[PDB]
Amino acid sequence: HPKIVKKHTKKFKRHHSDRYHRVAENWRKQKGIDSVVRRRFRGNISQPKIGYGSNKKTKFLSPSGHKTFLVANVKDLETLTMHTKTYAAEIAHNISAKNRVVILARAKALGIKVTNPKGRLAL
Amino acid sequence: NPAKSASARGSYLRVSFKNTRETAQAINGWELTKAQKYLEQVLDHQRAIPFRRFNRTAQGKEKARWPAKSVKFVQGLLQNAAANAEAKGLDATKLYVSHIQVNQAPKESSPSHIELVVTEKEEAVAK
Amino acid sequence: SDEIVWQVINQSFCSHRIKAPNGQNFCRNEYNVTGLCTRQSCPLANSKYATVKCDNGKLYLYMKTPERAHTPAKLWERIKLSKNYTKALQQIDEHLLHWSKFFRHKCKQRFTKLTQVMITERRLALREEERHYVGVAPKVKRREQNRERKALVAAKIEKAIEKELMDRLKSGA
Amino acid sequence: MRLLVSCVDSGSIKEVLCNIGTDTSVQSALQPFHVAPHLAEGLKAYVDRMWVISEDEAILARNSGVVELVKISKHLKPKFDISEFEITSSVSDLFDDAKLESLSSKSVKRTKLVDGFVTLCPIKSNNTFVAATKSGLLHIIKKGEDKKLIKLASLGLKAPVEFLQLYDLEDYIFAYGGEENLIKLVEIDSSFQSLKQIWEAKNVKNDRLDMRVPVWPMALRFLEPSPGKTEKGKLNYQFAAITRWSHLTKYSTQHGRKPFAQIDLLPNREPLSQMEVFDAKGENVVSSLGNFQSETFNELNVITTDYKKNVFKFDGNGRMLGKVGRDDITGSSTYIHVHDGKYLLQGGLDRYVRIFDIKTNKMLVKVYVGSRINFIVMLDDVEIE
Amino acid sequence: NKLKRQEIFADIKHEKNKERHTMRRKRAKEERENPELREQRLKENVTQTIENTRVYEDDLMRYFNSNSNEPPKIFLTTNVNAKKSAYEFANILIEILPNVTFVKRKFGYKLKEISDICIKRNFTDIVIINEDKKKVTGLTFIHLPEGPTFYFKLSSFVEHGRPTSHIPELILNNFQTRLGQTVGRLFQSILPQNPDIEGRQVITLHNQRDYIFFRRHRYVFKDNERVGLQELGPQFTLKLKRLQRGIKEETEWEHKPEMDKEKKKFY
Amino acid sequence: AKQSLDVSSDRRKARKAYFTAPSSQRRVLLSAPLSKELRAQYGIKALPIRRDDEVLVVRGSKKGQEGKISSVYRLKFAVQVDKVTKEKVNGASVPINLHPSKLVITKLHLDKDRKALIQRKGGKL
RNA sequence: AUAUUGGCGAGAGACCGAUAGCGAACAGUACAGUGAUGGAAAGAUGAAAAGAACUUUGAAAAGAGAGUGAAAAAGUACGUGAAAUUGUUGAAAGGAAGGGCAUUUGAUCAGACAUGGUGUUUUGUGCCCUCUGCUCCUUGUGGGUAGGGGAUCUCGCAU
RNA sequence: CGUGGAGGUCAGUGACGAAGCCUAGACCGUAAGGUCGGGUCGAACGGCCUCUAGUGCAGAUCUUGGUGGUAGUAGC
């Protein structure tokens, strides 16, 4: 597949997200006109913009080359039979370990890659 | 290792938090008998408890004070720990205060919780 | 009609659609060759359809025609696929004679994928995997962790070892 | 009541004398009157099979390849009595481990497969008994006028042999089988000097994965001949068997060689064995040997034990009726046998002798014997005053 | 009312503590003059610890365990797709087990095949460590003849002295129960059976309720008829499991999660 | 579904009524089903329980236990069964509180009022 | 026929959820004002108290053992326990710190129970060959299911 | 993008552990955020098309509640 070129691997952080504890790390655009970040002066944190857009041919593809697809039960898992190479089955965090083994068995039978196998399981 | 250590805790005491912390720091890591002797001497004003954080005499060479009120509770807790170790059948000579901590208690005066742990030193080892 | 049904299922909440994070609308319907809810692929949006499904080890070529739309109880007919791969492909091609190339290609791909899914038999034949997946409940984990610590504290292994050594060498040297 | 327990570890017969409600696990609970070993030979020559000819004379078989006739005597010792055992005659050298050793390869998993007595029951009034072994050797032993055992013939069956069951329902025919060995019906000549293979079972069609269904019948029990239509060429026999792979198979010779129905008793083909016919209400609907006195499978109810801990109850359609000793059996039940239709003898690796009530599954007796249990027989159900 | 409930019980506890302290002081003071009364009171008051409230063959040993007449060769391997932690644990296994041979898992030789090969090589026991994450979680031991085996869960694995080349002395504790002494016999037949007391090396197994603690120490005696000991490195605790009684057939005691409710009987 | 306009299906109102129900209503609340053997005898499904009534335990850790009842704790909505008691660390025995809905009556206590109630409820004796 | 924020008694809400909702879910109570008046804070233990028997250090606070309990990481300060803040262990660094571009070092985390696919050669099987049947529609380029005979057999499977 | 509630659908998820919280763990997106790996927790919550609003905080000498330097200082 085409190379997965990540234009910006570093997570964007809100200005002063570390100077004050009351400011969440979630990005928020500065509204003040005098704000240096809004004017993107040299040396300031990078501002998200249209330039960092990832290419469609590699968008949403994990480093393993398989797209993530949440799976809730065997019925959902069976839908990836025709897209095993392009899609991978991801078990939801709320799935009890009782059904996790059954889901993993079906995934192995169909050859569907599992993004987070063995979760909550013990050998 | 619980099999080689004993614990003693005092909660909701009315001693000053800063003085209690200074006393605990001045006594952390000392031997049980040596720590008790040092506290007794402090009660006699022969030695002073250094105040390194919450604050000039010759006794401070080893900026010091004699917090008798806090020292009384500290020595009481040390005696309780020694009694616990004796109940556990530990060697009092090898006992040394390996952990001591002061925590601010609910509010007025500033009460605090004091807990300490004593552990037996490892010795008598040979091929 | 198909156009009205197609547009209603597309823009009016088809019940069996799944939205992946990538932005692809999936289709978990059992009667579809492809799990994508696009046109000419969803069985509900097309009067004529063909698909491969299996209940027992045998594989069956499922197809429907407007002759049975009015009677859903007899909507889909099936024929044994002659599980010999070379014979099965030609049988599928003959059955789908004059059908849209899309349907023939999708049916052949589905049949090939289902046939190669027999790897389950290979793993079943190569059984005796001793890992024996086991699930650990949070309540079970709590019991072992705390009770093991309590047992260790109460055991006093050092004292027992000392007592045994003293009792052993009293008349053992 | 009085029971005889076979102890593999000690290789001795243990006489258990206790009343209903005995429990050795509780000090305050009723305790057995007497529990002592008899005829100890060690784990090398432990008893393998036991049959009670009468309350005074019994015949025992050992894994060493020797069948010993045991004389039972009584002496008094509150006011109850205990029994003593004396061996009068025996026959040895019946085992042939070479056949089993040659079949060790390609087996699922096991050791050299030392031979052992699979079945021991009278052939017929005539004091004639048939001895079967895993090696396939079928020996005939008769009690002479002098009470000394004499060997009359040494027949040979297709090894490996896991079970043997005679057809006592007259209304000599017996069936046998083993690992990768389809069930075969055998007719014995009146002189016991020959055997005829009249009928052989056939495997069922392959599963979804097209894999051949393995054949491993662990036990078999005969039913009455099928009524109504009786086509010639085919035979008239009805029986059911339980396989290791948890498949409950019912056979009807009139229908054909292949079983007419197969039901999966447990998922993942759980190891199952010890198929004993029992009545849901405790009626003695089983013949002297254990065959079901009925001509229909709907009334058939069977008790089977898995190899981990459980004792399962199944009907004629494979439906699980419940469990016996679910909260008390901590190990595999090596031996289970319905006695008088109401008492269920239980024993295994847990070293506890248990007697369960078929009517209610209640644990009636619990006696600790220390050694592992492989065979249990009850002599009398009378309660000591 | 929360305030009323909190205030009422807060004062009640203070009064209860005051009464308890006063009663204890008076009892001690009066017992000082009457020592026998203290003894009678102690006899009349049992601490009711959990231990005190517990709720109630030579041929076998030789046949299902190793004996001094022939040293036991123990086959050591690891579950397929093993990693560094497994080999690190195998290093300690080599350091502690008498005669070990390490063989990489071939991924396809069935357990029957492994047993047959070991019989061909006259091996005595098979030990295999299994891992899920980068940590040891369970250990197994199987005897070749007649296939008596035990499976053990592994927890609290911790890596201070350097053991000498001497064979540590074997000591077992709290194996009175019939099931317990079977694991005790397994340990006595799997670990070295020839002590070399010179060098003061000891290996101890100590079960309390269901977990067995394995540790090594150096022991030195003094004139006070007491022996001091020092930790000799690794900490180890194990839990018996599945009690197969065969290679994989006829399990006898396999543990179930439904147990442990009784809080006693310390299987 | 409820059709009467005089009955409300409000959860809050029902919860308030249940907790604030008087002892007279709680007597009806604390009903216990009769054993299948007794149901055929008296031809009745359930009747209010009382002291001398003998009941069997069908649920809880004490399943399979039986004994004569000794008290009907209407305030706590619980009833006590003789020989079904807890063992404290100090040795004191405290009866375990059980709900009548989880117990089966094995032997009723017969009085004139109980006999009249049995006839009223379509039973027989 | 019309109004109805008071009274009694009922049926409901696309309403709010202990800093909301009436000020009051446990109050017009405590409390302040000579007074008319103002006017709060506060819900949840645990299935059940089974509320820590008992030993042991403390004039007293409560501690250490011990046990009850699914859990005490639920102990009447009790459904769950984050920040601001405070004390200890460890790492780092030193009239300041904070953020951005690129990287070394230290610590540390992931890193396939993947073990395959293809053509060939023995042997045993079936849905495979042959004979004899039963069963559903409609009628059709079908489906389901039985009893006798073998390895012409790679049509699939297992070796 | 996200939240309170409602109509519909997933014969959805869940005591073999739902929500919340923590996490020098990882994945996805330009981001509002979603998802998964590990610890406490216990009983409800969510994938999607619409409707609905007391729907999103960095300050308003902002309100309630909580905690620091000042300070063991002035002082008693």
Swiss-Prot record, chain A:
InterPro entries: Ribosomal_eL32, Ribosomal_eL32_CS, Ribosomal_eL32_sf. It holds the Pfam family Ribosomal_L32e. One of its GO terms (biological process) is cytoplasmic translation. Its main location: cytoplasm. PROSITE patterns: RIBOSOMAL_L32E. The keyword Heme does not apply. One of its GO terms (cellular component) is cytoplasm. The modification Phosphoserine is found at S35. Coiled coil: none annotated. SUPFAM superfamilies: Ribosomal protein L32e. It is found in: Cytoplasm. Transmembrane segments: none annotated. One of its GO terms (molecular function) is structural constituent of ribosome. The keyword Phosphoprotein applies. Keywords: Cytoplasm, Phosphoprotein, Ribonucleoprotein, Ribosomal protein. It comes from the Eukaryota. Component of the ribosome, a large ribonucleoprotein complex responsible for the synthesis of proteins in the cell. The small ribosomal subunit (SSU) binds messenger RNAs (mRNAs) and translates the encoded message by selecting cognate aminoacyl-transfer RNA (tRNA) molecules. The large subunit (LSU) contains the ribosomal catalytic site termed the peptidyl transferase center (PTC), which catalyzes the formation of peptide bonds, thereby polymerizing the amino acids delivered by tRNAs into a polypeptide chain. Belongs to the eukaryotic ribosomal protein eL32 family. This is Large ribosomal subunit protein eL32. It comes from Saccharomyces cerevisiae (strain ATCC 204508 / S288c).
From Swiss-Prot, chain B:
This is Large ribosomal subunit protein uL22A. It comes from Saccharomyces cerevisiae (strain ATCC 204508 / S288c). The keyword Cytoplasm applies. GO terms for biological process: cleavage in ITS2 between 5.8S rRNA and LSU-rRNA of tricistronic rRNA transcript (SSU-rRNA, 5.8S rRNA, LSU-rRNA); cytoplasmic translation. Keywords: Cytoplasm, Isopeptide bond, Phosphoprotein, Ribonucleoprotein, Ribosomal protein, Ubl conjugation. Belongs to the universal ribosomal protein uL22 family. Coiled coil: none annotated. There is a cross-link at K37 (Glycyl lysine isopeptide (Lys-Gly) (interchain with G-Cter in ubiquitin)). One of its GO terms (molecular function) is structural constituent of ribosome.
UniProtKB/Swiss-Prot annotation, chain D:
InterPro entries: WD40_repeat_dom_sf, WDR74/Nsa1. The keyword RNA-binding does not apply. One of its GO terms (cellular component) is nucleolus. Signal peptide: none annotated. Its main location: nucleus. GO terms for biological process: ribosomal large subunit biogenesis; rRNA processing. Disulfide bonds: none annotated. Keywords: Nucleus, Ribosome biogenesis, rRNA processing. It is found in: Nucleus, Nucleolus. Coiled coil: none annotated. The keyword Lyase does not apply. Component of the pre-66S ribosomal particle. Interacts with NOP7, RRP1 and RRP5. Involved in the biogenesis of the 60S ribosomal subunit. Belongs to the NSA1 family. Present with 2740 molecules/cell in log phase SD medium. This is Ribosome biogenesis protein NSA1.
Swiss-Prot record, chain F:
The keyword Transmembrane helix does not apply. One of its GO terms (molecular function) is RNA binding. Signal peptide: none annotated. The keyword Ribosomal protein applies. Coiled coil: none annotated. Keywords: Cytoplasm, Ribonucleoprotein, Ribosomal protein. It comes from the Eukaryota. Its main location: cytoplasm. Pfam families: KOW (PF00467), Ribosomal_L26 (PF16906). GO terms for cellular component: cytosol; cytosolic large ribosomal subunit. GO terms for biological process: cytoplasmic translation; ribosomal large subunit biogenesis. InterPro entries: KOW, Rib_uL2_dom2, Ribosomal_uL24_CS, Ribosomal_uL24_euk/arc, Ribosomal_uL24_KOW, Translation_prot_SH3-like_sf. It is found in: Cytoplasm. Component of the ribosome, a large ribonucleoprotein complex responsible for the synthesis of proteins in the cell. The small ribosomal subunit (SSU) binds messenger RNAs (mRNAs) and translates the encoded message by selecting cognate aminoacyl-transfer RNA (tRNA) molecules. The large subunit (LSU) contains the ribosomal catalytic site termed the peptidyl transferase center (PTC), which catalyzes the formation of peptide bonds, thereby polymerizing the amino acids delivered by tRNAs into a polypeptide chain. There are 2 genes for uL24 in yeast. Belongs to the universal ribosomal protein uL24 family. This is Large ribosomal subunit protein uL24A. It comes from Saccharomyces cerevisiae (strain ATCC 204508 / S288c) (Baker's yeast).
